[model samples]
Target: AKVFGKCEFAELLKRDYYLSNDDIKNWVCIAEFESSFNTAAINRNRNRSTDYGIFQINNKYWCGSDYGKNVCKIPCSDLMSDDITEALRCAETIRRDTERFRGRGKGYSAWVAYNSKCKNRDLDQYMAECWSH
Candidate 1:
């Protein structure tokens, strides 16, 4: 709660760069399914790989490159970072790339894709609710 309050994650959703209110809401649902808003979230598999952070960034790749260093400076194996700003920026970058590559108009289409694919849950519900709104 303290983290959420300080970070103003809701406000980040309201930025022009974000999808929309409904889309952001749907993202919240997706996050619940992914990590329940836990920035320190990680995934353990038999391969000893495939770790993730708040948005489930693949640790193997994202945590050990120019991108990783830029986002997760002062490198460590932890999922969460002391730099919440950089983390959110990374998420926004992902959203932008997804919108660009998917050939979608912008926020709405990006929201649709995120809800349908990345989230991997609440597709029907998101479509109905997102389109309706």
Candidate 2:
């Protein structure tokens, strides 16, 4: 389902989330472009790779596969759900890893949507009324 508003999306992602305020802002913006806050969203890449869930976690590296790396040790099907914790955890790992295989150079820039659109953009505005506590 699509998020009702920016703040709602924030709450969904912010719970148990540990990252910079800027990082979260980037995430919200990426969610806007990646899936419009729709947790069940899926995108199929031309390389026969697929991205799943709100963060669009890629199957080529983050999911269990017969050949490709499964850095998250998760089934791709697990990501296509309303709950986003597992996907979020994997995304956190992606941000922290320095390995070229699946890491994002130790930042959220791993997502092109972020660097191309949200980077240096004033995204904190989206977090307003976006939290309950």
Candidate 3:
């Protein structure tokens, strides 16, 4: 399991997802709150669904296995791997689909953490160390 520091996580979001600075900050907040930047993090919901990886992709919604609709069409294990590419892909899908269906300004709400902790909140401090001079 690889636990990323704040700057490393922010850099990955920018490098891999090509997100804007503001967007990277938002995503960094999500990963920090959801999984503490731990690639191997896993949480079992009260409903028997499981959330996996830094983005906490849900087994009942995103990744597939003996459960879930497999919206991302990948095994849940992929989300927990050291490589975050799959997690990033699934997260982008969630954001895109949520905005398309739930309307604008609602994409990140797909993550409960985003709504509870990151939404409309200042995340600049969380990303402060990432841009060292």
> Of the candidates shown, which would achieve the greatest lDDT relative to the real structure?
3
When 1 and 3 are scored with TM-score, the better candidate is 3
Task: State candidate 1's TM-score.
Answer: 0.51
lDDT assessment of candidate 1 = 0.51
Question: Local error of candidate 2 at 44, Å?
Answer: 1.2
Q: Which runs of model 1 end up more than 4 angstroms from their true locations?
A: 1-23, 45-48, 66-79, 105-133
- Which runs in model 3 stand beyond 4 Å of their true positions? none
lDDT for every model?
0.51, 0.73, 0.88
Comparing 1 with 2 on lDDT, the higher-scoring candidate is 2
Native-referenced Cα lDDT, model 2: 0.73
Model 3 lDDT per residue over 17-100, tens place: 788997788888999889899999999989999999999988997888569689999999999998998888899899999999
**Candidates in descending TM-score order:** 3, 2, 1
Report RMSD (Å) for each prediction in the order shown: 6.5, 3.3, 1.5
Q: Tell me the lDDT of model 3 at 41.
A: 92
List candidate 2 segments past 4 Å from native.
1-4, 15-20, 98-106, 126-133
